[PDB]
Enzyme design. Sequence first.
Site, PDB file in Angstrom:
ATOM      1  CG  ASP A 171      -2.012   0.984   1.252  1.00  0.00           C
ATOM      2  OD1 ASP A 171      -1.743   2.179   1.023  1.00  0.00           O
ATOM      3  OD2 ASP A 171      -3.184   0.602   1.514  1.00  0.00           O
ATOM      4  CG  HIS A 200      -8.301   1.182  -4.888  1.00  0.00           C
ATOM      5  ND1 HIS A 200      -9.163   1.932  -4.118  1.00  0.00           N
ATOM      6  CD2 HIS A 200      -7.051   1.602  -4.572  1.00  0.00           C
ATOM      7  CE1 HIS A 200      -8.467   2.780  -3.383  1.00  0.00           C
ATOM      8  NE2 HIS A 200      -7.182   2.598  -3.636  1.00  0.00           N
TER       9      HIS A 200
HETATM   10  C1  HEM Z   1     -10.028   2.901   1.874  1.00  0.00           C
HETATM   11  C2  HEM Z   1      -8.930   2.184   2.111  1.00  0.00           C
HETATM   12  C3  HEM Z   1      -7.919   1.997   0.966  1.00  0.00           C
HETATM   13  C4  HEM Z   1      -7.173   0.908   0.773  1.00  0.00           C
HETATM   14  C5  HEM Z   1      -7.157  -0.388   1.650  1.00  0.00           C
HETATM   15  C6  HEM Z   1      -6.369   1.185  -0.400  1.00  0.00           C
HETATM   16  C7  HEM Z   1      -5.465   0.344  -0.958  1.00  0.00           C
HETATM   17  C8  HEM Z   1      -4.700   0.640  -2.060  1.00  0.00           C
HETATM   18  C9  HEM Z   1      -3.728  -0.259  -2.645  1.00  0.00           C
HETATM   19  C10 HEM Z   1      -3.428  -1.692  -2.121  1.00  0.00           C
HETATM   20  C11 HEM Z   1      -3.187   0.356  -3.709  1.00  0.00           C
HETATM   21  C12 HEM Z   1      -2.101  -0.196  -4.660  1.00  0.00           C
HETATM   22  C13 HEM Z   1      -0.685   0.168  -4.173  1.00  0.00           C
HETATM   23  C14 HEM Z   1      -0.412   1.654  -4.331  1.00  0.00           C
HETATM   24  O1  HEM Z   1       0.008   2.099  -5.441  1.00  0.00           O
HETATM   25  O2  HEM Z   1      -0.610   2.427  -3.348  1.00  0.00           O
HETATM   26  C15 HEM Z   1      -3.792   1.668  -3.801  1.00  0.00           C
HETATM   27  C16 HEM Z   1      -3.476   2.583  -4.744  1.00  0.00           C
HETATM   28  C17 HEM Z   1      -3.941   3.856  -4.842  1.00  0.00           C
HETATM   29  N1  HEM Z   1      -4.957   4.381  -4.060  1.00  0.00           N
HETATM   30 FE1  HEM Z   1      -5.843   3.406  -2.458  1.00  0.00          FE
HETATM   31  N2  HEM Z   1      -6.668   2.456  -0.887  1.00  0.00           N
HETATM   32  C18 HEM Z   1      -7.617   2.984  -0.053  1.00  0.00           C
HETATM   33  C19 HEM Z   1      -8.186   4.228  -0.183  1.00  0.00           C
HETATM   34  C20 HEM Z   1      -7.887   5.167  -1.135  1.00  0.00           C
HETATM   35  C21 HEM Z   1      -8.538   6.465  -1.303  1.00  0.00           C
HETATM   36  C22 HEM Z   1      -9.684   7.041  -0.447  1.00  0.00           C
HETATM   37  C23 HEM Z   1      -7.935   7.053  -2.336  1.00  0.00           C
HETATM   38  C24 HEM Z   1      -8.187   8.426  -3.002  1.00  0.00           C
HETATM   39  C25 HEM Z   1      -8.742   9.467  -2.371  1.00  0.00           C
HETATM   40  C26 HEM Z   1      -6.917   6.168  -2.828  1.00  0.00           C
HETATM   41  C27 HEM Z   1      -6.110   6.495  -3.878  1.00  0.00           C
HETATM   42  C28 HEM Z   1      -5.174   5.689  -4.435  1.00  0.00           C
HETATM   43  C29 HEM Z   1      -4.285   6.082  -5.503  1.00  0.00           C
HETATM   44  C30 HEM Z   1      -4.197   7.454  -6.206  1.00  0.00           C
HETATM   45  C31 HEM Z   1      -3.455   4.846  -5.795  1.00  0.00           C
HETATM   46  C32 HEM Z   1      -2.346   4.714  -6.879  1.00  0.00           C
HETATM   47  C33 HEM Z   1      -3.072   4.446  -8.210  1.00  0.00           C
HETATM   48  C34 HEM Z   1      -2.121   4.435  -9.387  1.00  0.00           C
HETATM   49  O3  HEM Z   1      -1.803   5.528  -9.931  1.00  0.00           O
HETATM   50  O4  HEM Z   1      -1.663   3.331  -9.799  1.00  0.00           O
HETATM   51  N3  HEM Z   1      -6.910   5.020  -2.090  1.00  0.00           N
HETATM   52  N4  HEM Z   1      -4.708   1.817  -2.785  1.00  0.00           N
END
Ligand code: HEM
Lengths: 310, 308, 309, 308, 310, 309
Positions: D148, D221
């Site tokens: 993450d 996501h």
């Molecule tokens: C609610 C709990 C959440 C979990 C468990 C979660 C989990 C993850 C995971 C496992 C990834 C892939 C690894 C990474 O690149 O970080 C990811 C990517 C991402 N998440 Fe979340 N996320 C959550 C909430 C959010 C929220 C609320 C947002 C936006 C407001 C968000 C925005 C993003 C973004 C921008 C990426 C990278 C996407 C890319 O450009 O490849 N996440 N998240």
Amino acid sequence: ARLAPQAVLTPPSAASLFLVLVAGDSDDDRATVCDVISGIDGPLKAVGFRELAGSLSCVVGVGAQFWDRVSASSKPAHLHPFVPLSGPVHSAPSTPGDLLFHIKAARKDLCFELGRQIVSALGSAATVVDEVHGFRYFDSRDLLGFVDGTENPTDDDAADSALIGDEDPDFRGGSYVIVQKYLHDMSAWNTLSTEEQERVIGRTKLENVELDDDAQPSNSHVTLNTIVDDDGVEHDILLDNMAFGSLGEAEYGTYFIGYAKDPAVTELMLRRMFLGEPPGNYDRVLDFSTAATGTLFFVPSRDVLESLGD
Amino acid sequence: ARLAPQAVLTPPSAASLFLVLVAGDSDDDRATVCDVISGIDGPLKAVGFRELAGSLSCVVGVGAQFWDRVSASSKPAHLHPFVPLSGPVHSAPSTPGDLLFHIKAARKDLCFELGRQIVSALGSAATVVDEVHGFRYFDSRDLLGFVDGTENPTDDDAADSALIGDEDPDFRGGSYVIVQKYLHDMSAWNTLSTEEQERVIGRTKLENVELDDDAQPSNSHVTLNTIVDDDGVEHDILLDNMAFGSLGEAEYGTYFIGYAKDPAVTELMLRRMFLGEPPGNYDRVLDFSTAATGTLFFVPSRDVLESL
Amino acid sequence: ARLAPQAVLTPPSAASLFLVLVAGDSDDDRATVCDVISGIDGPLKAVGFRELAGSLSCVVGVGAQFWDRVSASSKPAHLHPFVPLSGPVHSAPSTPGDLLFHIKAARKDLCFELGRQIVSALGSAATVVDEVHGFRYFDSRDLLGFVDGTENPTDDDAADSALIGDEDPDFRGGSYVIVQKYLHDMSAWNTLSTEEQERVIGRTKLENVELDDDAQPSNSHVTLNTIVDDDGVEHDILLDNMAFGSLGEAEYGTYFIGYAKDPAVTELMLRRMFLGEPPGNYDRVLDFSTAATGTLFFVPSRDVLESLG
Amino acid sequence: ARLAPQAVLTPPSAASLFLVLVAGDSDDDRATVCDVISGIDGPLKAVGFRELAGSLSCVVGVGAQFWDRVSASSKPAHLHPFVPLSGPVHSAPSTPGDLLFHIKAARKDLCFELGRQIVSALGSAATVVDEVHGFRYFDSRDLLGFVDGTENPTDDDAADSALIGDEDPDFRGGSYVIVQKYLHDMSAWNTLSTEEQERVIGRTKLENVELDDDAQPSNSHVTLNTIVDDDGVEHDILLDNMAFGSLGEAEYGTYFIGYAKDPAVTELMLRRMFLGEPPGNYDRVLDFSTAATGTLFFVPSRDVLESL
Amino acid sequence: ARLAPQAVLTPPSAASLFLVLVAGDSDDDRATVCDVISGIDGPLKAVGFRELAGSLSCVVGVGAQFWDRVSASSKPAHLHPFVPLSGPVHSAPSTPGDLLFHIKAARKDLCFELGRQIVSALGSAATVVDEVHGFRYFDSRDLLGFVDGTENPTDDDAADSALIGDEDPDFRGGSYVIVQKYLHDMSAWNTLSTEEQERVIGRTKLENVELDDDAQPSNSHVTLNTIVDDDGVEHDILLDNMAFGSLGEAEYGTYFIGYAKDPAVTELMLRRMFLGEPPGNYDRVLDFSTAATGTLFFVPSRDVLESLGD
Amino acid sequence: ARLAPQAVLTPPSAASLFLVLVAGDSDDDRATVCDVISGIDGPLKAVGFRELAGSLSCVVGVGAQFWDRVSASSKPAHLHPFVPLSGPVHSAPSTPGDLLFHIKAARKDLCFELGRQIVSALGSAATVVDEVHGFRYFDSRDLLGFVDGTENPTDDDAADSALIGDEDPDFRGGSYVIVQKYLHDMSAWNTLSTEEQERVIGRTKLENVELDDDAQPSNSHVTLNTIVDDDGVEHDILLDNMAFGSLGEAEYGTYFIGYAKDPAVTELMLRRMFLGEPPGNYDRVLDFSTAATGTLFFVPSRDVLESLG
Ligand code: HEM
Ligand code: HEM
Ligand code: HEM
Ligand code: HEM
Ligand SMILES: [Cl-]
Ligand SMILES: [Cl-]
Ligand SMILES: [Cl-]
Ligand SMILES: [Cl-]
Ligand SMILES: [Cl-]
Ligand SMILES: [Cl-]
């Protein structure tokens, strides 16, 4: 002792988890509990092995009432519930707990994960009644700002003080552990000068040096927790206390956890603290610390733990 | 155990070196080999002392044939060559090896430098027949993606499992070690679902929790490698497995190395894996892992090693 | 093996403090010294507990003479003042010392603090005659540029070499320790070629490999300090040597500190070094190293130490 | 950036502390709060200097309402309260918060001690409304078991994504941060296969490799949180998410905290998650994660913070 | 520079991976290669982020022949294949390579995993022709036993020496890197005395101190690799050499890897080493080191790398 | 920011070496000094590269007088010898120094080795007049028991406070550094209560919190060393103080070392401390601390340094 249950003699850690649970009424609940704790080495290695250093440890403790439910005809000589104490202003309550998991590691995530696996395995068979996340605070200080754990026995002396031997050979290698969750009144403590604080404790604040005999109050924490018998033999316990707290609820705490081959020693220390020696001459630390819990557990050796019950 | 040869019970390390050698025919080759291995604490301290932490360890193993060349008058009770296995689908070859050096340290350079000094000292007297550079892979994983080594016995159970005792007092403190170099078929492994892989192993993949008894297949790796005698007592071995490989040759490997006071425990695990329990019910892990080597060595105590 | 005094068998550390003291002739002085050293586990834990790793250790040594002031009988079988040596070219002086504090830790601050608390607690009752701040130099080397401490015994071999056993049972678990503060002639050592230095020591310089039996000078430091009895059994000591120095005084030192269950082994080594074997065939390390101190101490077990007086 | 307030671009840490506070009504409460936050480099250095490594950082955020109380004459271009979302299945509440302290360090005690000093200094002038103790979980994982934070922009891309520039020069060097405290339904998550979970996220679980375009579901996501403008330029945010929880209350959480020079990027990610793209096609991650908080803060540069 | 492709200026690491590959003939192979290298920041963060320290780096280099296949009308000023050299006894061959991945980390597993993900992504579109696992050897020594990397430029000076600037602004921030895999003859090297070894190198062995002018042979490694022009301006390169080896095949090696804003500097150093200055006065290190490979690559800045080709 | 000399802005380290030297009056001597210091990046990399972390740094300072011997013109705007102070009770002596080597590293050995190579290369051309081995003491504390170095500027505030800018452009990126080797009266300090010591310093002892404005003595070290100009703008210096000491000589020191782009700030602090503000209202830290040395140096940029002579 790498990744082995009931390693009571572990050195201090950066992180700890203290979990106290109450077992369910039923025979099903009782068996699940036995299955989990008797196989505790499973989760312990499942988690601990993922860290190269192998700093994770887990000590299981069992309360008197639960012990009698699973091992009626065989009992450690001194297993009984925590003895509550009632001084004129400060009291040590006896609060529930059938199970203690005393978990230590170099990292939070390791303690959390093991706890998570233990709670998951117990399911509806047990209920968490106390949970404390301990952490090292600067150079081994407690939240009162004093180095905490200094005079702990080490080596052979730690084994002699903490672990059951020839006196009760059926349970040799076990121990007895008492926990109390203390909350401090930081405002009141901060109205004291450093020097007065040093008199309450019995040691200098920054440098952690024991005050000499002539400047050492008879009610200092150190004086009251020094146990010498008529024969002139010192009796010591092994402490693994940790800071814990919550900024929003204004909780600043010290978690007391003391291991001894005979809880009589720990009990005497407590009697001297809460009731005084001479009577009324009580431990002033108690003006600034209030116990919210009080539970005694028997800590079985591995061989005895693995046998429960089954 | 700090910088002592034949420290069998060392914890896991970030790096290791497994060197298998065949000794030469001549009486001189035999004497050099014996001179080198009997004085192994020299090179060991010569390199190991250079690291403050003192993480460097070296265990010497001697094969059955070579032992008979140097000590025909007495023999550890269970020393024989590695027994080949031919199962319904997979086989475990028995491959040559007179000497094993199992080297562990916190750093590659320590392992490499000790290996360098040992090979230089042995010169023409011996030849390297297998050499594998082991490394820790994330949180104690193997290249199949599973936490690997979890259920190793520890402390007293470890010495009881691995060290020779009253049953053969002439060689008390010694051990027996079996090595096999496994190469994996990664693309085949990747066509399984995680759940499929979990059933092959016996544990959940990320979290490394044992599958409950009723979701455990009878042919799971963990199931087949659980050895329980008639009085209900489990018999365990000590595993020091490390990942290894080469990206250019598409080698992705697990070096198996297991220690036991009685190799029959390890051997029985192997038979139960390769032939199955019941027969035919073999270890699916072998559908994705192929052993390129198989060698048994006796691990003498320091005293015995020093007298060779 | 954590924060217990008289931990002789500790592994090498990054920092050291060697404190040698003489005690007052007074009786108040004798008593103070005894209170401080008998309760040494106090300061040791007071300081050591502040470090998570618990790397701090402190070994207390008591000189033969001061021992007699606080233990009429009993006495350890081989306790006596450091035997001075007068050799063909080089000499080992026997210098004063009633108390040795051998302090090791992962950090300087822990060493310094412990020493500060020991000196403060002793007050007027004793005086520092020698103070050395030892430090690890690169990959366990001394300032002559050689790996230093390599052939030290370990595990059970270390216990057997250093700790008093069945042969003097009232003092079982004690040890005898000899210190010598050596100062080096750097520019003279530098005029040697690496290969010459290797002949002097007995081992290769960079790689720390022991020279072949046929390339090994009969007066190499290694051969001179190898002790084999008449039955063929080797006898070893435990060394905790550290580098020290001062740039402005042009001091470049190795602090020798060796522990044995019987100083007969150490003293024989010292004889072979200073006098030579055969006589005159002395240790060439001595041509570039001069001992400024020389003092023997008994290291009581923890029980013996706590019982004074 | 060593021990400087408003160090937005700090790398990940082993530990963190997220403190949300509401300031009191009175003119005195407002002045105390302003005195404390404008001098935040005091407590920061007072604790942070005590650690050799100097890992301690503290970022102060100020809510829209509180800002209007202290600086009605000028306003960062995008400062407004957090906008609530009501989707087909899930909702993101807007919850109170005048102050945010985002604290990071290599050790818990540093975070805790800084938080202690800040709360003591604020006294009766403010109340803690949310407090979460973040911790690294193995190899940068969240409690759902996935790595993450992987695709965080770094270096120049990071400053470009997160720091206010020429578009609003009065508040150059500032940022906008949105926090949401998510709690997970772990048992529900565990009924999915690993493959199912991978499709929910957009990446493989153990190995953290992006799914190829043709195995990527349109509602993953990763897919929904990929923001591409009409000229084809991706717009990224800076995430500092940490695990947290409580075993007794069966809380297993992910604290979301995201920084952007323009919060509309973050807001659009939220709308695309909660309402779907196209509408109805919402982020399945929300089937297993529920936000208990939602608050937007403006992160002033040091200069601006110091003048409040 | 945390987890960013083409971070040429990274500090020394405990572990490294050098991968040299040859791209396939076809337009499909060509596009897959472009897709992988242009998106290299993907795997880099996929792997690197799993380590808290963020020590993982990956520098991509592209050979002249492959560059012309994907970017025909736009080319860095000095991109050409490695220039082979032929002295009377020692030669520097030019060996194939379209792609370089120069991977560094604090741990082996990180370098291995990234390499594994890169090779997997390339599939049948490219073939590994050289693979070297570099490791730190004691206090930054090479297998000849000398501290290796000392005189590397750092700070602004490293940027000035290594990275393309105003002279070729279309490729500003790129670099040119040359690799040679050297194998040593340890027997022959060990027949020399330490002092003779010091004369070959130009620095003392243990203490790593530069020999003074009056004891410094004109053919010492240091002398021949000191580049001063007519204007009296020193020209430096940035080296990331690492030890590597195999005990069983008796390979003890040094992997040369040098970055420069203009490969002319590196080439001159090589000419002086293999051919001598004055002619015949060649670098004696070459009596004990034999180059098995020789390949030059252009290292594009991130912006240029991300554009290929597409 | 790795292994480059004149790295003024480095973070705190576990170990320090402060070497102050006077140069020979000879011309051979001047030239040698110049060869050594102009090529200082040599030894620095020779030593520093041997540590993976690259924690080793070395700042070279040149005294006003010796500067004049090798740079007729040019000269930095504010270079001059340390102004001595004579106050009501306490005095700051101005002591000799032509060369300062301020060495920092994560290990002692790296410090010592670098210093050894610098001293050896200088040979007879210079002499050590002051040598201090600094060490980190617990959680960044000095031997008075207070956290020491807390309010140091950081990031751009540090560069702006310490590095010569547009105002003296021939020497841009240089700095002025003042050292004073303070020795403490421990037993006198110990007779104060913690709260009194807190008044003396200006901050709480354990927790290192700055005292309230209304509890802040007008002569507390903190207030005296706070510099605010007429327009309201604060002026800061960069401190790299380390503890040092010797147990047997009963020396317990803080080594003061402060860098500014203009020594006017440092000298004003020193005046407020020694003379007092108002006059007589001097820094009570001075009642328990006595400066044994006092020397100012110009820290040339890397370009300026490499150009001598
Ligand atoms: C609610 C709990 C959440 C979990 C468990 C979660 C989990 C993850 C995971 C496992 C990834 C892939 C690894 C990474 O690149 O970080 C990811 C990517 C991402 N998440 Fe979340 N996320 C959550 C909430 C959010 C929220 C609320 C947002 C936006 C407001 C968000 C925005 C993003 C973004 C921008 C990426 C990278 C996407 C890319 O450009 O490849 N996440 N998240
Ligand atoms: C061939 C490549 C192999 C792989 C990839 C592999 C993998 C694993 C894994 C992932 C585990 C579970 C974690 C643990 O407790 O270690 C395991 C357990 C185990 N393996 Fe292997 N293994 C291999 C070969 C072998 C062989 C050849 C043997 C026996 C000769 C063996 C004996 C064991 C034993 C005794 C356990 C612990 C079982 C228990 O008591 O729960 N493994 N192995
Ligand atoms: C001038 C001070 C000394 C220096 C610089 C020095 C240096 C060395 C070196 C470089 C070694 C080889 C590495 C090792 O095995 O430790 C060594 C070994 C040894 N030294 Fe010293 N030494 C000094 C004084 C002494 C003294 C005074 C003694 C005896 C009283 C002594 C006894 C030994 C012993 C027993 C060994 C191990 C020999 C073996 O069994 O191989 N050293 N010393
Ligand atoms: C006797 C030697 C000294 C001792 C023991 C000492 C101790 C301290 C302490 C404990 C602090 C508070 C923590 C901090 O912010 O660093 C401090 C601050 C400071 N000291 Fe010293 N100091 C000494 C000498 C000096 C000298 C000679 C100067 C000026 C020439 C000086 C200038 C400062 C400054 C500028 C501060 C920061 C004040 C602020 O802005 O809050 N100190 N010192
Ligand atoms: Cl926890
Ligand atoms: Cl290796
Ligand atoms: Cl010290
Ligand atoms: Cl916290
Ligand atoms: Cl690799
Ligand atoms: Cl030093």
